[PDB]
Amino acid sequence: NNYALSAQQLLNASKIDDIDSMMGFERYVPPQYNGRFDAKDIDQIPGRVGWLTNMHATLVSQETNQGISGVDFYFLDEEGGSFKSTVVYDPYFFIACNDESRVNDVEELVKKYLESCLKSLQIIRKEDLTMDNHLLGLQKTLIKLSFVNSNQLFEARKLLRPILQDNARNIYNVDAKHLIEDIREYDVPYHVRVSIDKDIRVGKWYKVTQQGFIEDTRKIAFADPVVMAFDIETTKPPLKFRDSAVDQIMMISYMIDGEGFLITNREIISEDIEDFEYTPKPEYPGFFTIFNENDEVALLQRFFEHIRDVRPTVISTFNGDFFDWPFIHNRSKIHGLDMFDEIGFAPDAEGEYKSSYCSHMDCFRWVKRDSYLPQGSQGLKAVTQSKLGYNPIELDPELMTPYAFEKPQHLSEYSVSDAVATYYLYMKYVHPFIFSLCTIIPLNPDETLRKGTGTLCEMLLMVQAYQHNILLPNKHTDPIERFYDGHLLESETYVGGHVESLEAGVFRSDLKNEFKIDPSAIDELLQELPEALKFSVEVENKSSVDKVTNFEEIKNQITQKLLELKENNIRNELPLIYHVDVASMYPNIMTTNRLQPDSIKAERTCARKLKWAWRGEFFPSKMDEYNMIKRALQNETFPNKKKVLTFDELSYADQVIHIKKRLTEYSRKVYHRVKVSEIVEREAIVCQRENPFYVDTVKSFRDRRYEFKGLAKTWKGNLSKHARDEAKKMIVLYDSLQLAHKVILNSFYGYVMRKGSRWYSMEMAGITCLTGATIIQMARALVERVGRPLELDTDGIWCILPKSFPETYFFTLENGKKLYLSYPCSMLNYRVHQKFTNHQYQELKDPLNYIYETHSENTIFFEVDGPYKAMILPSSKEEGKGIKKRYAVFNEDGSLAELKGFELKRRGELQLIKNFQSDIFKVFLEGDTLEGCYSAVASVCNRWLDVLDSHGLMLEDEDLVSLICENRSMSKTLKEYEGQKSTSITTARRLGDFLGEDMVKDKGLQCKYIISSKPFNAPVTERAIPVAIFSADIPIKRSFLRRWTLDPSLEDLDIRTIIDWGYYRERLGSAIQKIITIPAALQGVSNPVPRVEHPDWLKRKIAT
DNA sequence: TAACCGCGTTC
DNA sequence: TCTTGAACGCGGTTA
Ligand SMILES: Nc1ncnc2c1ncn2[C@H]1C[C@H](O)[C@@H](COP(=O)(O)OP(=O)(O)OP(=O)(O)O)O1
Ligand SMILES: [Ca+2]
Ligand SMILES: [Ca+2]
Ligand SMILES: [Fe+3]
């Protein structure tokens, strides 16, 4: 019932109100005032001020029978206390009409059909970007159906779903039902709807008054919530995962606002623990006090009791939604405790643990979304070293439970290791970012942390659409089929970024390089030189040439250098290793071109036609064959007392899955292919006068990210003097903050392609990509002619320029100030603004009379990364091909500048290749000549080959397994890969066989394997031996080690007997080839490690 | 062979 | 239900 649901949500509400009272969040109703809610005199109006930390939807009773929708807001005050306060706002959505004439007619019919759920209805008007002449002022008439609570709203939709689907009777010559076109803004989440309409945001200060919340724009900083972070280490069966059903919590470490506490279960932890200290850097103090308890239930209850004592409004964990919280929850139930009644936490619809007064900050969600760290470096170990600057305590999870008996202090100091890292990781990186993000995104801390960047973008866009009175579009629904010249398509897409491998090998400042400069390109550069340094001064640095002392001097110094290189073109010199890269490329291409989904028109100036490249992946079959297989499927029966289902009876989508997978069979059996793919160049018109609310939202977020990037460089430019340890401290703060916004910023591009988007446009996303490829290839077309481009990717070109090429000069202003000039950079930027500027950008100057001014927009700019020391790019093993998206770059202080894509960086490759790649790359700095350098690298390669050919003799059996184990992660559970083979798959099966099916039950299983030599002549996937078998009982070992070798006579069990050493040697050989010997070949040096042979295509090209 | 896939990168 | 995109390397599969 609708009155039953409201009754259920009402006692949830009274429970929450009691938990909030317990934790200090009593509902405050402000003193009554009947005056002007004048905002300047804020300190006269009676009420209570507070920093807003949370907001949850609610249902509120009479203070009729059903409740009223509202939102509880959770504040911290100025007096060290807390309070909570409720706002009510009627849920609402809109009905649109085919004909504006009879709008009241459909308004009386809706008053009839929704009589038992509607509360009120208005006639309002919003701007529809779909509508004709909306730019001249026209608006859309809509009925605003208002409701008492969120249940009546969904109830009205359930009644209107008939009427809408119904319109999809004397035939010899309209009713009110058939004028309901669609319904709008029914989707909007309620607390989002309140936070938007009432302009309330978590993280701002408000004075709560009877007239509403008053933003107090005076307070400088946030308040200071009491923050608590906790980790739990529990018992574990050997070589098995931790199971809440069987195991029990050994200890719970935690920190509350800099003070640490460890609670221990003295029924598994042998002795008792003294209050010790763990501070791995001076800035991260950690004095812990231990609460030694007896049983678990005593441990679980010093925990629950300590939470109520401190009443924290933030609790942080690391992966606490998947492991820590559900473990504590289930072990309290077995001990007869309701965690909700004790703490207020309970799982939500996604199984994540949330409370009302207290945000649950799982940092694992931050590192995964916003850290800009590779997944290989997203464990808490790596996250501490990267972003906190020390090496935390580390302990083998197999030694964990026995060290509880044998060495309790060590396990105690690994437990507080994880807690100190978690608390300070939250306070330095997660807390400032999320709560600042909350001041602009209409969500509370829990959802700001966990929602996807696409969805964060939708929020920001929905505030904008609303505040400019723009009617929200409904969410996009995927076309269930599309057809291309009769062929059913699998994927409709566009050509994305351009990326080129051009040269491989070692390039280095100390070693000369041959260049062949195009004289005709120089001629161009000096022709455009005069206007290009005017550009560097006025548009790059935002000044005037009229104020610069030495414009002609710099203009002459470049001229002779360019002229010298024009006559003496074929030159052999040291190179300048540089990187050019467009700053926020795709956003700036959108803002420069006024690119937004509502701007894309279809034949119906103000018109900037731009091209994109459409790619379809259709089946080779004809359409006669498509209906043939559909008829085949219709005659056959499908499963679900009704487990018998017509083909027609199933949803149009699921049908497609069956048609598509049957069509892959017929195509893979009549046409020898599953997909034919085709590029089609298409053009679209982009209206330059359309409401730029989307473009302006991306412009505003771009500007927000740019400021953090500029502050980062400002401290980098201030790095000359603990100055070298405090200036470099923030380089990371600000870079993190700029990198955190990078993914959200670029999601404004991806958003227009996302499922369920409200502003879907493939045309828009394709136009951005094609423009970006045209720009990057224009830049390479010129760098070819004056240097050697090494590697190019979307918006970036690595290159060597002749040492003779003009680089850096400083303009001087009458002020005495200097302006930075990189002629390699400004020579491209000037070309970009010549060739890619939008001279059709129209913007309303006077809205009151609809008068637009037209002007020229170009925010596209390259940026120069740096004069570098060395760069090592690998080469493919196949002829002619290169390897894209991998390389290493070094700074002139020897330090590593960039490492991209190599197995060293990726999550769980074969460790041997990871340690090899960690070793050689720095060795590429040694030697005095190109060949002397390759000889230094070779010496490292032979040392590794020595390890492999010696069958790791001189290597301990503990490191030998660490070095030869590959670690692949199963994105699902083993059941879902049915009909697939992989080393990750079979090693997971063989592990379920060995240790039980209970370790095959959770997704994301880490599969650590060895490839065995036996069974010989078998595919590599059938020889993947899980690594824990060698840690097992000698009986259990020798059983499975032969069931997997298919050698029942097997007796020797030393790892060196089982391992297919020829297999790992071929892998090491491949890494030696691609990084070293084959690029060596391409730079004219004979193979530097003869023990790894060149391929026969390279052997043929030594004699030819 | 040529085609395609899963994972985790670089954009 | 909630859900940013495409390009690419590598080691495995398949017919
Ligand atoms: N996560 C991503 N999601 C969507 N598009 C991306 C993403 N990363 C990169 N791109 C797209 C849009 C980028 O503008 C473009 C080039 O990427 P990239 O050079 O790494 O960053 P950027 O140019 O956007 O900012 P910046 O160079 O200032 O750090 O490719
Ligand atoms: Ca842990
Ligand atoms: Ca860029
Ligand atoms: Fe137009």
Author numbering: 28 to 90, 110 to 214, 220 to 224, 233 to 663, 676 to 711, 717 to 797, 804 to 1186
Sentences from the paper on this structure:
Here we report the crystal structure of the catalytic core of S. cerevisiae Pol ε with a P301R substitution, orthologous to P286R in human Pol ε. To investigate the structural and functional impact of the P301R mutation on S. cerevisiae Pol ε, the catalytic core of the Pol2 subunit of Pol ε (Pol2CORE) with the P301R substitution was purified. There were no rearrangements of the N-terminal, exonuclease, finger, palm, thumb or P-domains, nor were there any alterations in the interactions with DNA and the incoming nucleotide in the ternary complex of Pol2CORE-P301R. The P301R substitution is located in a loop, called the Exo-loop, but does not affect the overall conformation of the Exo-loop. In the Pol2CORE-P301R structure, the R301 points toward the catalytic site, forming an ion pair with E292. The R301-E292 ion pair interaction is buttressed by a water molecule that is stabilized by the backbone amide group of T293. In contrast to the wild-type, the P301R structure harbors only a Ca2+ ion in the A-site, coordinated by water molecules and three catalytic residues D290, E292 and D477. Interestingly, we observe a steric clash between the terminal residue of the ssDNA and R301, suggesting that R301 will interfere with the binding of ssDNA to the exonuclease site. Taken together, the structural and molecular dynamic simulation data show that the mechanism of exonuclease inactivation in Pol2CORE-P301R involves a steric obstruction of ssDNA binding in the exonuclease site, in addition to the loss of catalytic activity. To summarize, our structural and molecular dynamics simulation studies revealed that the cancer-associated P301R substitution prevents proper positioning of ssDNA in the exonuclease active site of Pol ε.
At the eukaryotic replication fork, the family B replicative DNA polymerases epsilon (Pol ε) and delta (Pol δ) synthesize the leading and lagging strand, respectively. The exonuclease domains of family B polymerases have several highly-conserved motifs (named Exo-motifs), which include the catalytic residues (D290, E292, D383 and D477 in yeast Pol ε). The catalytic residues serve as ligands for two metal ions, and substituting both D290 and E292 with alanine abolishes the proofreading function of the polymerase, which in turn increases the in vitro mutation rate by ~100-fold. At present, many structures of family B DNA polymerases with proofreading capacity have been determined, and their overall structures are well conserved, consisting of a thumb, palm, fingers and the exonuclease domain.
